[PDB]
A paper describes a structure:
Four cryo-EM datasets were collected: I923V MDA5 filaments with ATP, transition-state analog ADP-AlF4, or no nucleotide bound and A946T filaments without nucleotide. In the absence of nucleotide, the I923V and A946T variants both had similar twist distributions to WT MDA5, with intermediate to high twists (81°–96°). In all available structures, the side chain of residue 923 contributes to the hydrophobic core of the CTD and forms multiple van der Waals contacts with surrounding side chains. In the structures of the I923V variant, there are minor differences in the side-chain positions of several nearby residues that occur, including E924, K925, H974, and Y1015, possibly to compensate for the smaller size of the valine side chain in the hydrophobic core. As a result, a hydrogen bond between the side chain of E924 and a ribose hydroxyl group in the RNA present in the nucleotide-free structure of WT MDA5 is lost in the I923V nucleotide-free structure. The loss of this protein-RNA contact partly explains the reduced RNA binding affinity and protein-RNA interaction area of the I923V variant reported above. In stark contrast, the I923V variant had 3.3-fold higher ATPase activity than WT MDA5, although filament formation was unaffected. We conclude that the isoleucine side chain at position 923 regulates the conformational changes necessary for ATP hydrolysis by shaping the CTD fold to tune ATPase activity to an optimal evolved level in WT MDA5. The increased ATPase activity of the I923V variant will result in overzealous proofreading, promoting premature dissociation from dsRNA.
Residue numbers in the entry:
A (entry chain A), B (entry chain A): 307 to 534, 539 to 543, 549 to 644, 668 to 694, 699 to 715, 718 to 809, 828 to 834, 842 to 945, ...
The structure:
Amino acid sequence: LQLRPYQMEVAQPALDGKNIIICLPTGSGKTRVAVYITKDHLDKKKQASESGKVIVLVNKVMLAEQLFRKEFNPYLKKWYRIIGLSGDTQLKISFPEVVKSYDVIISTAQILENSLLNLESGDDDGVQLSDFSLIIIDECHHTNKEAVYNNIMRRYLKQKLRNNDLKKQNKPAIPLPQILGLTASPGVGAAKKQSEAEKHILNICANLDAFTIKTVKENLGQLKHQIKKFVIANPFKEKLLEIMASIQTYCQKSPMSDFGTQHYEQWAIQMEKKAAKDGNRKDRVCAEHLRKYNEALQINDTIRMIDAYSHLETFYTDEKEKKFAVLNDKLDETDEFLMNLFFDNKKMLKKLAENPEKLIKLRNTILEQFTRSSSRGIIFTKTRQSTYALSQWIMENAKFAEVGVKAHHLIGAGHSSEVKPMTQTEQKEVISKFRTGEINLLIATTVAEEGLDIKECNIVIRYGLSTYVLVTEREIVNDFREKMMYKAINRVQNMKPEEYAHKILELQVQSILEKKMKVKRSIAKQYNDNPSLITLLCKNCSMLVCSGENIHVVEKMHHVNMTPEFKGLYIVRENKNGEIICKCGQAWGTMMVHKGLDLPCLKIRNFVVNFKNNSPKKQYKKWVELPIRFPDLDYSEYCL
Amino acid sequence: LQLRPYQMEVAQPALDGKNIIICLPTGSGKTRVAVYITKDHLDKKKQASESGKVIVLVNKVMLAEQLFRKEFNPYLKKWYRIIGLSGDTQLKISFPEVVKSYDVIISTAQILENSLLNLESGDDDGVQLSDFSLIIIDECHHTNKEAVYNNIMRRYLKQKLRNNDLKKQNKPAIPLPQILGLTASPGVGAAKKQSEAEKHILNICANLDAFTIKTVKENLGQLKHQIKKFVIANPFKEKLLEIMASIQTYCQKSPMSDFGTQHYEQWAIQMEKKAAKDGNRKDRVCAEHLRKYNEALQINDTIRMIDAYSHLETFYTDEKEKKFAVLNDKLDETDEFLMNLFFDNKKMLKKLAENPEKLIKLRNTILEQFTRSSSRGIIFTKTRQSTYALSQWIMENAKFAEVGVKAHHLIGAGHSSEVKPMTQTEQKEVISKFRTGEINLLIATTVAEEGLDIKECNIVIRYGLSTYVLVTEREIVNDFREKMMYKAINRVQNMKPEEYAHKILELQVQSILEKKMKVKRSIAKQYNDNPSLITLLCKNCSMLVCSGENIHVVEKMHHVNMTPEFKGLYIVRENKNGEIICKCGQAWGTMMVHKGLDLPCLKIRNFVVNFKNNSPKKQYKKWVELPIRFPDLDYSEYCL
RNA sequence: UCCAUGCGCAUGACG
RNA sequence: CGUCAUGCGCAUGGA
RNA sequence: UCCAUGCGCAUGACG
RNA sequence: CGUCAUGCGCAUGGA
Ligand SMILES: [Zn+2]
Ligand SMILES: [Zn+2]
């Protein structure tokens, strides 16, 4: 396994047992450097005939799969055992056994963290860093806070301090493994001065217990040989603002801010909370409606107003369906007022919609851009909805199709934001098409920025964040941060070893003590653990919905209300298991058909709590917030 | 009937009316334990002078025959009545009468299940678990899902819950029988942790309504006295891959995966389905051809390429015969292209075939192995075709004959996979020869693994799955699973009785409610039951083949088309009742000469459906999938 | 004893 | 939920 | 392969 | 400390 010279120089310190960091520009193939380090370390242990283990940690499963497929296994098919562990891949043997075998391991951090926790717990599945003899970490820049990498390494730091104390006062010391570190760039965060950036670098080193940073400052020639611009370009709004002012007058609400900013939205949420604490109308409901209107304004500021019309149409059609279902099996004055205030203008609002806008300007830019050019293209943005809007809008246009510009959307897989997520398989398929060429342009929020193997891209356009385009100053600050980070690395590399040791030791002690106080506060957090001390009410209509003892739990994850008395209250809806709404139209939850039972599961976000101590109402957004515990459902009862 | 001490201890709880499980290592003769339990129970009932019945259930007919021949009858020839019931043995008296007589019964589960269903139905042949006073089950580990054992025992669980309700609210309770359970090992399935294995064990106990598990933890000495290693060792491929790439280019097909994996085959099947939904060529036909090529690649990866040549030769010779028959009484461009692309290389492909391979390596291993050694040998594999290939190939070699190694193939009897099945009689004969010694080595897929009485085997080789050999990590996971299962049993045995009762009760309720939802969904499945609403077309050539009313049914099992108009379409073929093919060469079905009528029976796999509602085309693979029903043939019509 | 057909079930691998 | 392989069981019919 | 749920983490903007 | 957006990871369950 031949190694490049610039790679060779940086790798040399690690071959001597030094736990260091190794940061190289993207495209330099530092993965092969890690493979060489691994092979050399395992050969050294073979010569010494000792436990040779490596645990490669990557924050994304895609990276573990790629490393198994391309770099580690092919180069080590013959000598050693390898396994591409991950959480999504179903294995048949537990993790401790994988440690007892499979000399070389590619995994994901939180799996190892879970195994360590189980060791600390009573699950009896044990594993310790002492078992491993070397640890390799990818994207070390994420080891800056209580993330998984730092959570793993803090245990190692604590054990190292205990080992120092034992050494000084005792003969035996628990062995600890070597620690390698890889990263495209150490990064700088919340830095305004060289001093702050240097403090950040020292913090990263202390978290990784590194000895020194390593870069290539002598063989830059072939590196530059292998590794190789900012361009910048209504009546519907005021009509909607008029409606907003009218509803404010109807509600006697003082915004204190303008329309189309996070300040107004935050105030709306705060007033919604207050209204829920008062059990009053025209405040909570109007708070939600103003939230929706402000969202419409914000999207219109960057997206065609047709999409704001679609958003409002979906919202009010859902409201109509809710009220119609309520009528089955009357309407409040507030609901009547708001719905009539909307519907009376919906048709004319749409009429305004078609009238011609950052969108048209961006179109004018990109159509001109595509005349130059194989062709490739990328677009960045913020919201998931914006991606769908741009995709369908560019599909509607005929000029792009005439040029042959085929575009497709791309987003993450998180189940949030009330948008259809994209699965990992679909992301893989889309990227494969992009490589093949079935799609000429990509629209991504942040996925294509890192992780996804997107390359040979001529155009990269950022819309509201190798030609580079930024449609809408941030590039200047980004370049300044890059330069400051490089200078900080240069300084830190050139430092007295003892001063560096003292500083990193102080930082390690600080981190450990902070974690100790975090543990103390977390333990002190939950203290009540009461069976039934509350009552749940509908936040819109301050009516009794549930008691504290009639609730039960399934899977220790879902909370349900089995009592027949409760079932006479809610209503069911479904369109395209089923959704559960109030008598007032407020959503309550979902009908889960689990274990041969039709459990009406409910969510806490949409209810309000009333303690038996008459304490003020509260909103939680999550069950775990309160410390009181509920009993687990017993199927013997209700079996019937 | 003397009983061994370790057997005595485990059997003791059952003598007190406890429904338990009894798992002992193979070779400990737990059958005699069951016989002792049966004799004691029947003697106890004789003393009480009540209905003494036992229904022994075994999942294989061979086991029932062996129990009748060796263990139950010989030990109970004198006192009680016994009968070796099975589905293959022709009896003269129905099953309910056998219950009314024949105190002790050895049978197979699905026979009892059929009788219970008839009781539930209107056939008037009745039988109930209340009739029996004891139930004995062999290989209880199969009672984990909706298999026959669990399907029988769920009725018992439901009846037990009804009995508890009656007891609490009423005086009388329907009697229920004792339940014994035998198994070599409870087994662990889909378990990665002690918790999951324990959950599996509890599920098995709930399905069997066991009181406790029982093992021998005190008399292990004589058990170990009576009851008593992993070894591990081209241009044709690329030539065929070149042809595959060429045909892909001819078809504009994007595989998205590599060659020689189930992914490519699954994609080929999906694209075949899509093509059938489009009624287009070069997609379905090429899908089948690529299926065959991928199968050839997979078998070549583990088998000599000569067998891949044989497979392709059979396929293309059958195609030539089909096209020649079509010419009797033209060829498509796609068929011409593919057949010419194959034949032009067949001779040179064979020339490559003889050029020297897991096969030669395995030969080198086994020839060396046979120098040690009465001699015995076993080989395991996956495919039925691999067994025939290995048998004929080892026959071709002269070294094995020189050593005196005689080998024979062995497979199951299922009528699937397009391979010649092996009959039960032939399996018995082969095993008898193996015991006698006419054959020194056996080649089996999975039959010899369990059920078949194969023993005193020095060598057991697994090729792509008391010396043990594994030619090609799974042994490690198997040992881990064994250890985890043993620990789970140890834990479950040592548990509070009331907690165990509560957990098993919850599991029983869960299983019953799940079955209730299954029944609901099955009832809701079929709703249409229409006489004629579809048309059948040939999937290759999207041409009308049959209407919905011209079809008729015989035996409520076969669907035929009596209309003369249909007969003018198809063609007949036969080589070595007859087979029916299309005008395009597509296979349609078989000519069944039944009840003095030459019915042209057809299969649904090879046709495509077109609803009268213009719904999209569909593929079913089975008639029962659609709910619409067809009329039964009336012989008065067509009698002529 | 052999042959043909239909239905159901479980295991393993893969997606 | 789908694909492949393997094994098993039951129910019909014929020689 | 798809769907639902829960939990945790980081980044950016804002207050 | 709170709000919004984005992305990621893990753990359950079902088809
Ligand atoms: Zn309400
Ligand atoms: Zn045809």
